[PDB]
Write an enzyme that holds these catalytic residues in place. Structure first.
Site, PDB file in Angstrom:
ATOM      1  N   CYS A   1      -0.136   4.241   2.959  1.00 55.25           N
ATOM      2  CA  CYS A   1      -0.074   3.724   4.058  1.00 55.25           C
ATOM      3  C   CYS A   1       1.624   4.626   4.512  1.00 55.25           C
ATOM      4  O   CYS A   1       1.936   4.994   5.391  1.00 55.25           O
ATOM      5  CB  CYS A   1       0.140   2.716   4.256  1.00 55.25           C
ATOM      6  SG  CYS A   1      -1.817   1.245   3.529  1.00 55.25           S
TER       7      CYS A   1
ATOM      8  N   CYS B   1       0.768  -1.346   0.130  1.00 56.81           N
ATOM      9  CA  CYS B   1      -0.129   0.054  -0.119  1.00 56.81           C
ATOM     10  C   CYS B   1       0.565   1.301   0.384  1.00 56.81           C
ATOM     11  O   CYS B   1       1.844   1.629   1.004  1.00 56.81           O
ATOM     12  CB  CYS B   1      -0.945   0.357   1.055  1.00 56.81           C
ATOM     13  SG  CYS B   1      -1.344   1.390   2.211  1.00 56.81           S
TER      14      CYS B   1
END
Lengths: 110, 110
Positions: free
Chosen positions: B37, B34
């Site tokens: 993130c 991700c």
């Protein structure tokens, strides 16, 4: 290796069943926490099964095989890649209905 | 442990450090695949650190904690849950800027 639909077991398995596939392949990146995956997976599985080997479906649980997720730049699930001759040739993310999947497959298969 | 920010290692560690926390907890569900993130996690972790124990941050690698993503119906990352005495009291998904995170923390801490 009889089934046209299968869980990927590991890196090797991916390289053999997917990258080295003689038929077009749909790769379903999914996880147990992904609700839409629970509808899409079986829907796509059924439609691939009906093609009797013209296409194969390689399922990749991104919890078990997070390396493959990183490699193929997955950013959400479900992600489905169409692959041929080892290259990514098409892609969708999210749920699709039977009509949409049928179109996706016919485009891939020819 | 001494730190207000930490990785959740397993189920018991979640019970001890989240469900049984005496302070409010922010639980950060992330994944190695991700991109967003990479922005959010550090931003939030620093702001949490600064509170010197008024809140704690439990980082959850989704792919190592299928169970917890199931339990809390986390279907994407990043997802952040604010939790208090065992229950979800706020939630957001995606990145937030510093102002936004400030507000979120003030709302949780008071």
């Amino acid at each position: 290796h009889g089934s046209t639909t299968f869980n990927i077991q590991d890196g090797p398995d991916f390289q053999d069943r997917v990258v080295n596939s003689e038929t077009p392949v749909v790769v379903d990146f999914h996880a147990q926490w992904c609700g839409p995956c629970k509808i899409l997976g079986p829907r796509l599985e059924k439609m691939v099964a009906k093609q009797h080997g013209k296409v194969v479906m390689a399922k990749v649980d991104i919890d078990d095989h997070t390396d493959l997720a990183i490699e193929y730049e997955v950013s959400a699930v479900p992600t489905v890649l169409a692959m041929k001759n080892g290259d990514v040739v098409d892609k969708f993310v999210g749920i699709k209905d039977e009509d949409q999947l049928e179109a996706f497959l016919k485009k891939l298969i020819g």
